[PDB]
Amino acid sequence: GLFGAIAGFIEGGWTGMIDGWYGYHHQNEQGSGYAADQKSTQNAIDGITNKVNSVIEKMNTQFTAVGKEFNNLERRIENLNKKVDDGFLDIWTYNAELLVLLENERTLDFHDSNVRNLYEKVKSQLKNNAKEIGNGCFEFYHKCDDACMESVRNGTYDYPKYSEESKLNREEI
Amino acid sequence: GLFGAIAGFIEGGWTGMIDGWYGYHHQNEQGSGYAADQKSTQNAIDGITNKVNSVIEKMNTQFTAVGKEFNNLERRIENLNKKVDDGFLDIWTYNAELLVLLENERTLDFHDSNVRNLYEKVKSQLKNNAKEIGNGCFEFYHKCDDACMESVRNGTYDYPKYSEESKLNREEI
Amino acid sequence: GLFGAIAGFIEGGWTGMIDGWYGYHHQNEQGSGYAADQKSTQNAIDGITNKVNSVIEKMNTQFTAVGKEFNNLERRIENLNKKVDDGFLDIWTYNAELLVLLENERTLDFHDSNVRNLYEKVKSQLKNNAKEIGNGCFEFYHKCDDACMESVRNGTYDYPKYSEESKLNREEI
Amino acid sequence: HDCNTKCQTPHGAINSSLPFQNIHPVTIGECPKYVRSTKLRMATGLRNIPS
Amino acid sequence: DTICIGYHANNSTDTVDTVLEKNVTVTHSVNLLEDSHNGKLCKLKGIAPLQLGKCNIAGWLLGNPECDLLLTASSWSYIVETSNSENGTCYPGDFIDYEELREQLSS
Numbered sequence: 001g002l003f004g005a006i007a008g009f010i011e012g013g014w015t016g017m018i019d020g021w022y023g024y025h026h027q028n029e030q031g032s033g034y035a036a037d038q039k040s041t042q043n044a045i046d047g048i049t050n051k052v053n054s055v056i057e058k059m060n061t062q063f064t065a066v067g068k069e070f071n072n073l074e075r076r077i078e079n080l081n082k083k084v085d086d087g088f089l090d091i092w093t094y095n096a097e098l099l100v101l102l103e104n105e106r107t108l109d110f111h112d113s114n115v116r117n118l119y120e121k122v123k124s125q126l127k128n129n130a131k132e133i134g135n136g137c138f139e140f141y142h143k144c145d146d147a148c149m150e151s152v153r154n155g156t157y158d159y160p161k162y163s164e165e166s167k168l169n170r171e172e173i
Numbered sequence: 174g175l176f177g178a179i180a181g182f183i184e185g186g187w188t189g190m191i192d193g194w195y196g197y198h199h200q201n202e203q204g205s206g207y208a209a210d211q212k213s214t215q216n217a218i219d220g221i222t223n224k225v226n227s228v229i230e231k232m233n234t235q236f237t238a239v240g241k242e243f244n245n246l247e248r249r250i251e252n253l254n255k256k257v258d259d260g261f262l263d264i265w266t267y268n269a270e271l272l273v274l275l276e277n278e279r280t281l282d283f284h285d286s287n288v289r290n291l292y293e294k295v296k297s298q299l300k301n302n303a304k305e306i307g308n309g310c311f312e313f314y315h316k317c318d319d320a321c322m323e324s325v326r327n328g329t330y331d332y333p334k335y336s337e338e339s340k341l342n343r344e345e346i
Numbered sequence: 347g348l349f350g351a352i353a354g355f356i357e358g359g360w361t362g363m364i365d366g367w368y369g370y371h372h373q374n375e376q377g378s379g380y381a382a383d384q385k386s387t388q389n390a391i392d393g394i395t396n397k398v399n400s401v402i403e404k405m406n407t408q409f410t411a412v413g414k415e416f417n418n419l420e421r422r423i424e425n426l427n428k429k430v431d432d433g434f435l436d437i438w439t440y441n442a443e444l445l446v447l448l449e450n451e452r453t454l455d456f457h458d459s460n461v462r463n464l465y466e467k468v469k470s471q472l473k474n475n476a477k478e479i480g481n482g483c484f485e486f487y488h489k490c491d492d493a494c495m496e497s498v499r500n501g502t503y504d505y506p507k508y509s510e511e512s513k514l515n516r517e518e519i
Numbered sequence: 520h521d522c523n524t525k526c527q528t529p530h531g532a533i534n535s536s537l538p539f540q541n542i543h544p545v546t547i548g549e550c551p552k553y554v555r556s557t558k559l560r561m562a563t564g565l566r567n568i569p570s
Numbered sequence: 571d572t573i574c575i576g577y578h579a580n581n582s583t584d585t586v587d588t589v590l591e592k593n594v595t596v597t598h599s600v601n602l603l604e605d606s607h608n609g610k611l612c613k614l615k616g617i618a619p620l621q622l623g624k625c626n627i628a629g630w631l632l633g634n635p636e637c638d639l640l641l642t643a644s645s646w647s648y649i650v651e652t653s654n655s656e657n658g659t660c661y662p663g664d665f666i667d668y669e670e671l672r673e674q675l676s677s
């Protein structure tokens with residue numbers, strides 16, 4: 001992971017999560033579960049969709065191309081013609097393969113990067129109210145519930161509304 | 174934003190700032206304003222300049238190319254010639270367009286990335302003496318003035334010279 | 347540095363370190379030195395090896411290509427043939443050079459990025475037990491020794507085992 | 520055969536809208552671009568890490 | 571009390587290649603390369619090809635006596651010759667500009 005998240009500080013995938021590519025895990029006393037992130041996932045969806053389509057548009061589909069015949073006094077021009085056929089075939093084969101190599105790296109990067117963005121966007125919301133407990137996990141300095149879990153995934157978690165509670169909790173360390 | 178800064182944790186642009194691509198906002202009691210960052214901006218300027226020129230150098234300018242005539246017993250070779258003309262035209266059209274797609278993504282990334290670098294380079298200067306107040310903003314734990322504002326943009330802000338003041342300020346929270 | 351580490355917050359190289367591309371510096375009372383990181387370095391080694399080989403495989407080696415002769419009533423087809431020779435030569439020259447430009451940027455990025463990953467992976471291990479003393483350096487809130495230095499480079503440093511000691515140390519600031 | 524295609528090759532007909540094909544350089548109709556490749560798979564998802 | 575950020579995963583066995591590493595397993599992927607076919611010679615826009623079978627263009631156009639089955643052909647989507655297309659010029663000789671003619675026939 002060029003962005004250190006995937007196959008990095010967040011070691012694993014969640015075969016549990018099946019909603020989408022990026023998501024949170026939560027365990028409030030009320031219970032556990034998975035909830036994939038709409039905004040990010042839909043973005044990644046949209047983008048990567050655009051990426052495949054953009055690459056494919058650059059490929060005009062091939063029209064009728066049948067080979068040419070030549071008689072035995074036309075060896076030079078039959079060879080010229082093979083040179084062209086082989087020359088273009090090398091170029092398209094090289095372009096196709098090289099593109100797919102390079103762009104596969106970019107795509108995986110993209111996903112790694114989106115994940116890091118997510119994490120850090122949460123981290124900048126919580127701060128004191130929770131601590132970095134490793135592998136993309138926060139631990140709440142205060143008690144929180146399922147409806148509250150939806151404030152996080154909302155991008156609207158109210159840091160003041162629990163800053164009091166978390167303060168006197170954190171300060172017992 | 175692959176680097177989460179632009180269109181990310183720093184939501185907007187500053188039609189106010191017209192000095193350069195990257196810059197700070199400040200409001201000391203003495204007054205408000207904008208000041209673009211030389212070092213970064215000039216770098217980005219330089220680099221992106223190099224990028225356009227490098228791409229364009231790779232294009233040898235086209236020299237005289239006029240088509241060829243053929244008589245009605247030369248249909249094979251007239252078709253060979255069209256195949257070459259069309260073949261090269263596909264390749265250059267694909268190269269041109271594909272490059273510009275891909276490199277536009279890289280360029281925007283670059284800008285996003287420079288901005289994040291800037292922010293974090295400041296953040297590593299301030300630490301305690303100020304707090305992460307969101308959307309690329311710091312809030313000073315101590316009072317500071319216009320000439321002091323120039324210490325920040327200087328990359329020379331003296332963390333010790335205000336660490337005392339900020340300490341007893343921060344500790345009142 | 348697109349990732350802000352190299353030629354960035356970590357200004358310089360270590361002509362001292364000769365074990366590998368990425369490594370730590372340490373000075374415990376027992377003495378100073380350099381120790382390159384296996385896991386990262388070997389990864390970068392492996393990857394960049396794959397990168398060179400992958401690029402080179404995409405190049406089928408050139409087989410016998412000798413030019414063609416033509417008589418003085420064959421100027422059109424001699425010109426067709428030159429057009430093909432020149433056309434393919436432009437394309438391969440452009441591909442070769444353009445690739446190397448673009449991929450050189452990616453490679454350097456890669457190295458910058460690996461370094462940042464390393465730093466941050468350490469930082470997430472230490473936290474309180476040490477402070478960000480600039481240019482990719484930590485300062486231990488507790489005393490530590492050569493065998494302990496190997497816990498860091500191990501990726502297994504025991505944060506609890508010194509959290510006590512560091513606590514009462516840090517709290518004297 | 521009594522059979523319908525938008526793309527014919529000496530080996531047989533293709534019925535696909537992928538950009539590339541490695542069946543035959545000789546084509547009639549609207550076909551994918553012939554290439555020498557054996558595999559052309561583009562990632563869309565991310566690295567699959569089950570453990 | 572906790573929350574975590576994580577990424578999808580599944581039972582896929584799709585592998586792709588990348589600059590940095592070969593044979594990477596991935597959650598999702600499209601295949602760009604078509605490699606299956608009919609096995610068969612079909613109609614194009616509903617018109618059948620002309621099967622020259624054991625004749626070749628010369629035999630067909632000149633009317634080589636072995637090519638009577640073709641006498642009736644008058645429209646086609648494309649022309650097929652076969653490894654057995656040898657009945658053409660039954661009386662020995664050159665067919666001048668034979669390849670141009672074949673190229674002409676092509677449209």
Ligand SMILES: *[C@@H]1O[C@H](CO)[C@@H](O[C@@H]2O[C@H](CO)[C@@H](O)[C@H](O)[C@H]2NC(C)=O)[C@H](O)[C@H]1NC(C)=O
Binds near residue numbers: 523524525534
């Ligand atoms: C290619 O073959 C497939 C079937 O093998 C066809 O795919 C079908 O798509 C049509 C039109 O969108 C649907 O109504 C069918 O139900 C699909 N088939 C199946 C089995 O799901 C396609 O029509 C074929 N095209 C050609 C030109 O032969």
Ligand SMILES: *[C@@H]1O[C@H](CO)[C@@H](O[C@@H]2O[C@H](CO)[C@@H](O)[C@H](O)[C@H]2NC(C)=O)[C@H](O)[C@H]1NC(C)=O
Binds near residue numbers: 585593
């Ligand atoms: C791609 O990865 C797969 C799965 O990890 C590998 O599958 C193995 O292939 C070997 C060698 O042919 C088999 O004998 C093993 O039984 C397979 N192992 C597993 C875990 O499925 C495969 O090695 C890789 N392919 C290449 C070309 O490297």
Ligand SMILES: *[C@@H]1O[C@H](CO)[C@@H](O)[C@H](O)[C@H]1NC(C)=O
Binds near residue numbers: 581582
């Ligand atoms: C993969 O997932 C599908 C359902 O999404 C399942 O039915 C299929 O059998 C699975 N394959 C494997 C190998 O687990």
